[PDB]
From a paper:
To better understand the molecular basis of the physiological function of [name] in the immune system, and its role in autoinflammatory diseases, we elucidated the 3D structure of the F-[name] domain (residues 1–289) using X-ray crystallography. Initially, we solved the structure of the [name] mutant, and subsequently that of the wild type protein. The two structures were almost identical. After superimposition, the root mean square deviation (rmsd) between all the equivalent Cα atoms was 0.275 Ǻ, which was similar to the estimated errors of the coordinates of the structures (0.23–0.24 Ǻ). Since the [name] structure was refined to a higher resolution, hereafter, we refer to it. Each protomer consists of five α-helices, with the longer helices, α2, α3, and α4, forming a helical bundle. The dimerization interface is mainly formed by α2, α4, and the shorter helix, α5. Mutations D266N, E277D and D279H, affect acidic residues that are exposed to the solvent on the convex surface but do not make contacts with [name], and those mutations do not interfere with the interaction. The same is valid for mutations T68M, V122I, [name] and T274M.
[name] is an adaptor protein expressed in most immune cell lineages. The F-[name] domain of [name] binds to the PEST subfamily of protein tyrosine phosphatases (PTPs): PTPN12, also known as PTP-PEST, PTPN18, and the lymphoid phosphatase ([name]), encoded by the gene PTPN22. Positively charged residues on the concave surface of F-[name] domains interact with the polar heads of the phospholipids in the cellular membrane.
Residue numbers in the entry:
A (entry chain B), B (entry chain A): 5 to 289
The structure:
Amino acid sequence: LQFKDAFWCRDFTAHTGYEVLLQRLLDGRKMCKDMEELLRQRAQAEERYGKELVQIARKAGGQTEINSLRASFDSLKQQMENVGSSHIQLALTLREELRSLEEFRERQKEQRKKYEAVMDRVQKSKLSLYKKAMESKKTYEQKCRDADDAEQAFERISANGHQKQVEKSQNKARQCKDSATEAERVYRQSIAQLEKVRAEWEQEHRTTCEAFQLQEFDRLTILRNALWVHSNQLSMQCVKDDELYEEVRLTLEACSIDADIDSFIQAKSTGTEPPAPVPYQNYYD
Amino acid sequence: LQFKDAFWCRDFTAHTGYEVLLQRLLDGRKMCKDMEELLRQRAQAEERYGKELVQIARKAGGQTEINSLRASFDSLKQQMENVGSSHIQLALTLREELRSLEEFRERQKEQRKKYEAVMDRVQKSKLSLYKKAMESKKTYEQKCRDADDAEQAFERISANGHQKQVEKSQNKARQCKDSATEAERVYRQSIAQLEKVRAEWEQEHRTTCEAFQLQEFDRLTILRNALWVHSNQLSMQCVKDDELYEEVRLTLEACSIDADIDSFIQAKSTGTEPPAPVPYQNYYD
């Protein structure tokens, strides 16, 4: 199905098809803004979260610990900062995707406005010339009835009437037929002018429908792609973080409880022999 | 080598080995607090981050969109709330791990204080009896020098001195030797009392060292496992989030651009034929 084949109106004076299509583009524009707002707020959350993780890592303690357990705790603080910075970078990625959608939306608005100007102009002219044609049609039909009455009035009083009275109706019927001829010419001219604009309107409408369908195809394409890219970027963030936390686990594999205890003893041992007992010392021996 | 075999002092009055071991337990207690503070702050970040994701999802728009693209956007909002709620649950998980370490830390302090009480009592008694023994040694040696002087005074005048003077110095020298003998028995007893406490101190020291080593083994074990659990819980969060974002991609695979355009046309189509042209209508037909 195409837009150009499904949004016509049997009513000559109705442009509901164009109104419905234009309303769809406005609804699509709102959808693009909502997708933009979600990216903006998500980016703000990621930056706030990422900065907080970095602050926790930089301010965390562990300075009284030594050896392999210290190296494992230091690894966690280091990888926390790496995750936090990676989320700050993710916020920049989301804001670039947001900027791309923002550019696409205004580009579509610019082109949409041009078609709106053409359609508004030709639709107003079409309804104006239709109004004039129906006014000319009414006048033409009244002038015909006026001419028929004048002719019937002439034939009536021309059977036993005075030449002066007949001459009055003779001229009145002639003037009425002249007015009917002129009203027909104006009516025919009104029909010709309306037909010229109707042909232009039909082509512009069909042209606009093809353009509006291309905009909708492009918008649905870029919005579906944006959701796919967004979901992948979030999934890629989970993979990056998992790899960074794995670095902590790898350090933990090198953490041996016995080695740390042996390391403390070797570094801080004060002596291996208890003090000798205090004996009695004879002052003369 | 063990704590009980490596933290002795050859100096009888020094307990640096016990002081060094006690300092290590205090440093280890600070390390447990630092691990507690990191978990506490990480939980706060996860709760704040999780709550923000839920609010973004609940307030996000998309109400003007229809059909499969709407279902994809609604899927993203739904999975955002599921991720946000999952992070709030993660914060509760972290606070339970934090509570477990807090309980372990205070249990160790309670037991540590008990060993400190035993060591403080026997070390002070050991230093007290040593001080008294050295005082008895000083008194005993002074009484001996007094006896030597009294004996030297007797030997001086016993060659050409008056019998009365010689007898007088003989009695003074004998009385001084008696005082030195009495002071010797006091000195010998001081040594015996100190030796009983020295043996008691040595056994208590060895007992405390074995206990302090068991505490260090327990602390290093629970802190190593806490880091392992923490890293695993964060990695499990990456997998949970990745599974939730995968649900969005599954919805996107069912998103067809042609189907959405066809669905809009079928629902909003206004007509398939353009309006007929307005002809000139002869009043006499």
